[PDB]
Ligand binder design. Structure first.
Ligand SMILES: O=C(O)[C@H]1O[C@H](O[C@@H]2[C@H](O)[C@@H](O)[C@@H](O[C@@H]3[C@H](O)[C@@H](O)[C@@H](O)O[C@@H]3C(=O)O)O[C@@H]2C(=O)O)[C@H](O)[C@@H](O)[C@H]1O
Ligand SMILES: [Ca+2]
Ligand SMILES: [Ca+2]
Ligand SMILES: [Ca+2]
Ligand SMILES: [Ca+2]
Length: 195
């Protein structure tokens, strides 16, 4: 992309409005004053994607802070997290959220955090050195449906995906996992399906 080689240093969350597409054209973003990328829960998101907002073609440098907050009906395309912060992307409100392309590395805990009922799809994605790829918020029992399609994972220190919800489901297709003791931590393994 034509912003490749540039570094945008920001000091507040970038809000992408409903109906908008933020296209970074390959820019690298470094956030300052928004978090250190540790496990502290009080960091700011790099991006807030309002319902029906899209994001594409961004590299998020360290510190990853609180990553991308999605409010539903969002396409997140070609986003690279060089160093995931507290988490990489959080679904904050109901809708369909797509992560297509890109990659993530160095997530101490979760990459994707699902805090509202949603349909969540990860497609054509790589992640390395992570605690979990997907976590439905603990002890919640609303329904999420997760799809992992063409996803390649390496060095997964807890599990691919974890939910405490019996009604939630995970579907996978062309999933490749290296160095994970425990793929799925759901109430029953019958909640996990191939397609
Ligand atoms: O949106 C968030 O960032 C979310 O973070 C916390 O919750 C997650 C997870 O949903 C919780 O179940 C909990 O996870 C457990 C441990 O606390 C955690 O360090 C790791 O060991 O995983 C555990 C697990 O998956 O069960 O805490 C997670 C976290 O620390 O990020 C908040 O509690 C939640 O309110 C919200 O802010
Ligand atoms: Ca955490
Ligand atoms: Ca957290
Ligand atoms: Ca990290
Ligand atoms: Ca978080």
């Amino acid at each position: 992309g034509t912003n490749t080689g540039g570094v945008l240093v920001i000091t507040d969350t970038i809000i992408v409005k409903s109906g908008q597409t933020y296209d970074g054209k390959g820019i690298k973003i470094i956030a300052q004053g928004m978090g250190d990328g540790s496990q502290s829960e009080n960091q700011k998101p790099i991006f807030k994607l309002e319902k029906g907002a899209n994001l594409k073609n961004v590299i998020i440098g360290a510190p990853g802070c609180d990553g991308i907050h999605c409010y539903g009906d969002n396409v997140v395309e070609n986003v690279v997290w060089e160093d995931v912060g507290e988490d990489a992307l959080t679904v904050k409100s109901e809708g369909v959220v797509e992560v297509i392309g890109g990659s993530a590395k160095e997530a101490a805990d979760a990459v994707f955090q699902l805090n509202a009922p949603c349909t969540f799809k990860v497609k054509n994605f790589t992640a390395t050195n992570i605690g979990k790829l997907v976590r439905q918020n603990g002890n919640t029992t609303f329904k999420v449906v997760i799809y992992l399609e063409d996803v390649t994972l390496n060095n997964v220190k807890s599990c691919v995906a974890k939910s405490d919800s019996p009604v939630s489901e995970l579907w996978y297709h062309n999933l490749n996992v290296n160095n994970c003791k425990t793929l799925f931590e759901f109430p029953s393994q019958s909640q996990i399906h191939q397609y």
